Amino acid sequence: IKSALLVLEDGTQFHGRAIGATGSAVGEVVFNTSMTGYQEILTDPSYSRQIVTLTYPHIGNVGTNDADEESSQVHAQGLVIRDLPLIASNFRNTEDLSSYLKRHNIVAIADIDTRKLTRLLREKGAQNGCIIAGDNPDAALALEKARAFPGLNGMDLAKEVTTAEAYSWTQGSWTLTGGLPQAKKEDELPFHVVAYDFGAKRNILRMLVDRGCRLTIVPAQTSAEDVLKMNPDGIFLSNGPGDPAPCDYAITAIQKFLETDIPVFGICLGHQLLALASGAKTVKMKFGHHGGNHPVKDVEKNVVMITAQNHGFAVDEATLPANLRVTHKSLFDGTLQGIHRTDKPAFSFQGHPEASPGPHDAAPLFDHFIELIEQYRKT
Amino acid sequence: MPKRTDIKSILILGAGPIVIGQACEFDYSGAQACKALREEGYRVILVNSNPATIMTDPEMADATYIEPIHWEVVRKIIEKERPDAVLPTMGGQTALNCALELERQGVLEEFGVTMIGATADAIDKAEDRRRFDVAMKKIGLETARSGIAHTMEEALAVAADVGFPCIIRPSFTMGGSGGGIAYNREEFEEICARGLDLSPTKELLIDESLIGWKEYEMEVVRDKNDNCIIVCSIENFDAMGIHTGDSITVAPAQTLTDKEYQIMRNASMAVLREIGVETGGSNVQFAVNPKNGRLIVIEMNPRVSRSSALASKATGFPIAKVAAKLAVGYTLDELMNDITGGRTPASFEPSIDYVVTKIPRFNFEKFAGANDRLTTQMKSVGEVMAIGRTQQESLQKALRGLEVGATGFDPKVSLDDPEALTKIRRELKDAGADRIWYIADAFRAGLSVDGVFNLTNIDRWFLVQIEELVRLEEKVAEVGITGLNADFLRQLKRKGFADARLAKLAGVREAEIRKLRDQYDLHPVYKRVDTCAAEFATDTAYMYSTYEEECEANPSTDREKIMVLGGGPNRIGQGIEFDYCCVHASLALREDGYETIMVNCNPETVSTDYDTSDRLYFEPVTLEDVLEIVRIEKPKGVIVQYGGQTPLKLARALEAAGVPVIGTSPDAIDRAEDRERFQHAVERLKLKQPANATVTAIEMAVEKAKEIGYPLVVRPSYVLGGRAMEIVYDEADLRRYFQTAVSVSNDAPVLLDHFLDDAVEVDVDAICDGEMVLIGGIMEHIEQAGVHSGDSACSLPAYTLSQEIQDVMRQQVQKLAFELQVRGLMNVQFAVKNNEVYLIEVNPRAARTVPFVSKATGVPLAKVAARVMAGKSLAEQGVTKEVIPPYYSVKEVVLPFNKFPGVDPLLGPEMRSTGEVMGVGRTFAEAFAKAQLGSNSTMKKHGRALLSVREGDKERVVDLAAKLLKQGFELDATHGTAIVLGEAGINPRLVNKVHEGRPHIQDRIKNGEYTYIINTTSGRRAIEDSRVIRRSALQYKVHYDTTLNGGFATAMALNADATEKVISVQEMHAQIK
Ligand SMILES: Nc1ncnc2c1ncn2[C@@H]1O[C@H](COP(=O)(O)OP(=O)(O)NP(=O)(O)O)[C@@H](O)[C@H]1O
Ligand SMILES: Nc1ncnc2c1ncn2[C@@H]1O[C@H](COP(=O)(O)OP(=O)(O)NP(=O)(O)O)[C@@H](O)[C@H]1O
Ligand SMILES: CC[N+](CC)(CC)CC
Ligand SMILES: NCCC[C@H](N)C(=O)O
Ligand SMILES: [Cl-]
Ligand SMILES: [Cl-]
Ligand SMILES: [Cl-]
Ligand SMILES: [Cl-]
Ligand SMILES: [K+]
Ligand SMILES: [K+]
Ligand SMILES: [K+]
């Protein structure tokens, strides 16, 4: 018998079973309502320093596969589930969940009341916690480490997960029939996008490439100047972990891009950054949005779309600069989900148009971006 | 826009009598719509022949019509109610089909009725197989290698194409009706023959084989703004090849990666869009090749389905309610999510933090010579649903919630039976209703998961789970009661193990495990259903039990509670009537100020609706499960009289365990339920009962039989629906059916009752408050005693019985009510022979005739009796005098013989009907004709009639023959009948039996020579001799009667017009003074 234990800042204990690597894990604990796409969720960089709790009891039913990786590694700090299936049963499976977690050296616990945990977080808001998996896990030590957690509030995580050297991406999206395609030749890509890497999901890139862009990924801290110098047909601002607030560099630079006529697009963090760069304010939500069933309204067309969400922070609507016009809102809590510059060719989305995992509903948000780009090209 | 202006009045098309493949789902659906609209300021008019439904409650809709669901009849309703729109999507196939014929016949057009929810083209687009297929290809979805057939010659050629095995699927049918798996040529013609005839469009869709692929369904809802959502996804346990309705299924889907889900999801939406569904919800089914994710579209249902009900109960998402509203132009974003206290919009996709399991409920034991292998045509009669935090937990609960005697995985074969692996093999290879239990037996027997997968095609994801429970079970067996430490016991409770299963394994008493649990403090917690996985709070109390940490029960201390125990899955003999009563008891008491708690796990019910009671425990109706809730609810009282045989059997145990049982006592119930005890009561009362004896063993039975004399009726204790009941003609008839009678007798004796020949059967429903007895109604049966009350047609008032004799019965009822200590409802059964009242039995509870009588008398008996049970007397309620309506009311039943062809469609002491209809008339004749038509009888007012009667009926046959002649029929008869008729002066046309020559009856019936068939038999052998007329009459769709009284009634009906006049229930009730 292999123990594990999860302790919340508030002193609440969850005793269960160890399902991943031996050791401890500390982070901000979050709940995710997705019924499918746990692997994609795990390899999502925005989860860095976060201990992810899944609401759907059985996690690992389909095993894992490389195509289902949204990044080169597992970003989640920890994994909290109700039940780890006996077997993985899917033709796409290459490695059972346990193995995978261990391999990625992830501390993970199973067999706990995730529902009670969910209700707690939803009720009393996000909390930091600690998971200790091993022989005799020390509940007081766990608490200590949890308590000692700093807090993603004011935590710039973007810098921590970003790429070292800028790079090129020309790879398209996955197909059932073909799987992950072969990278394309630059010449096959009309458009040329520059992407800030704030801890970006591969699906963003693929979907872009999918729409005719040849990409160049750059570190979060890259200078607008350095940027402009490549003559990009459009710029893009990825998703990523932590507080967007603290990221002055990127803020600064974005400000610098909005002086020019280049089209710009921000997803999630990028959304927050751009809103920041537009003089808007960002807040940290009670528990945030994490799932794949989130209704979002395109206020403009008065059309609803089910989306993939993952965000602990948000942009304050009642502090929005006039130049900032609301394109979208959440139908669950009326939060701000999308914005557009009145003056510029810059807009953003709070959720994930790229899904992975999740509904494909918001993928057209990309198309806008392509419109904006072919237009600047006409120019 | 918001809700529509040009529409004020809506006509909701009901689904008719419950039949296999088309059951309670719609009453649930129908009733949802009704409430939805009405809550929305709309005039609601609805038509439904079924009296047992809630939807036909006069207080449910503005205009309620209990009329035959015939376009001519529906016509007259339109004509009279001048409805604006018509909602034809909440009544299954009956409704779609009718909506379409109204349309065809230009009736809609004729009166300006707008078709809402779904248009006629959309409907056809999906209902039509060729069309559907064509759409699939147009939107690039894949379907199974097929072809369309309009003929046999054409079906042959497509079969010679796709190959065997092949899948037959007619257009405009559901429940796999008229379909099946052709594994050869012989099978092929028989199936196609049936489908082509069955098809409204005379069209079959023939497919290649996808047998063994995974099977999935998705429930989608689409609005006028084009908003689209997946309400629920479902993964089938049983693979492609076994109709979803006959399969164990779970929600949500379990073995798809996000990538496959999305594909499936997109396809689902693509499909609704392509077909034209804009203002509702539909079900899209798919097949998946486990080996490669290859997706294939199976079909679409442009209406609500049985999965919608299940899907609804599974997520807390009110499908039918929403859809209704959507049909009047409401949009998803507009609509609030019920359960989250309207905190969120209905436009979202539900997320659940538990596992839902549904298992079908069968009744193969009632249909001996039937093929009991599961296939593409539905055979089940009901379904149970369970919720658990884990699949194991979910599954086990469902097993015990099914009410088939299982505690969970009880063994089917012995471990020390040489032939055991062979039986297992078979059962696995060729699924029967018993498969799940055999799968466990296979693990006990040494078969591997792989070995099982190969035979079953059931995903290993499920299999390993069952193997693990088996291993845990073997441990319990080894360690025994001593090994039941808290840790282990706790682990066991968590995997769904029932105290009862643990008990058998540990070779102890269930009460011992429960005690042990007590010691340990091992009790379950209650979670709530909320549509969102706890993302938001809910103020609704829709809960399920689980063994975890946190409890969300939060019980009131505030009020006096009343617990109502539900009937579990529907089944022959115990159906919707019992739901209707439960719903009413809650409605009543609640209104009276009590906090009402419902315990039930039938998803297709209104009782399992969160609007219905204060509290809802979606749990198996077992002793263990009920005790736990009681433990926490601490109710004022519990009602065990409104949910069938179940809670009835639990009574003693409950009371004994401290449960506060209200209404008729457990001892009292036992006086009535135990045949020997009942027998005494009759004696002590100086009442008349046949010559009989109560017995426990054959030899003695045999001996006693000699005494009583044959023929004789074998009646077990503690059964309803005539389970295992049989008329015995001799010793050996006896030895053959005796054990079976005992096996179902509940440690109570089996009655041996002398058969009462040429006697009239009577049912009496009454209420006793200990002070007074209120007679609800006396119903005289058409078919004689010997034909189960549930299978007989009946009249209210009686149509032939003297007042003098009825009065004799009213008194016996009262005498009995009082002696037996009845408190609430009771149902009394009598037989009239020679102007002599005979007592057959007493049902110490609400009976299946209750809803009908209520509807007929305008008195809500379930409500009244519920109040009496809770303390309020009849006097106090002011319900003290028996009502005798001004009109006639006739009940007729619908039988499933057409689903089980290898069965002799004979009537008897054991109930086999699945549903019923109500006929209301100015006369008995008018009532009957209406009943007969609504029962979907093929009877004509002219043609040739075939007469083939038994000896006893040789006297009244003349009168019957005569009557047919005066009507313009032309007669044919067989030998003996012809002789008698000849002697009367009636000269039928001679017809050759099958052994007599050619052409014979079969030939002539088969040729379509006849429009009516009257065939009566007597005796085991003479029955088996005439089986072919019956089977052929059925196959060829000719109205047939198997009782002379039946024939006489038919005859009368000939002098009436069921389409003549229509009347609302409101209006019927108003005619009562
Ligand atoms: N190609 C095929 N191979 C094997 N099995 C099949 C195939 N097509 C269908 N089936 C099975 O046949 C069943 C019935 O098909 P279906 O189209 O749902 O009939 P239906 O009568 O319209 N259903 P319903 O309206 O819900 O009562 C399915 O549940 C499958 O298990
Ligand atoms: N002695 C008898 N003579 C003739 N017919 C009889 C006799 N006993 C019973 N029957 C027939 O057998 C049927 C079933 O007997 P019954 O005892 O009522 O069964 P049951 O299962 O308790 N029925 P129920 O509780 O109403 O669903 C009756 O409806 C009669 O048609
Ligand atoms: C579903 C019920 N029917 C087909 C629509 C057959 C009983 C109506 C007659
Ligand atoms: N109410 C019973 C149905 C009667 C059937 N037509 C037959 O006579 O057997
Ligand atoms: Cl816990
Ligand atoms: Cl294939
Ligand atoms: Cl142990
Ligand atoms: Cl059969
Ligand atoms: K635990
Ligand atoms: K199936
Ligand atoms: K269909």
Ligand SMILES: [K+]
């Ligand atoms: K009868």
Ligand SMILES: [Mn+2]
């Ligand atoms: Mn269908």
Ligand SMILES: [Mn+2]
């Ligand atoms: Mn009975």
Ligand SMILES: [Mn+2]
């Ligand atoms: Mn009876």
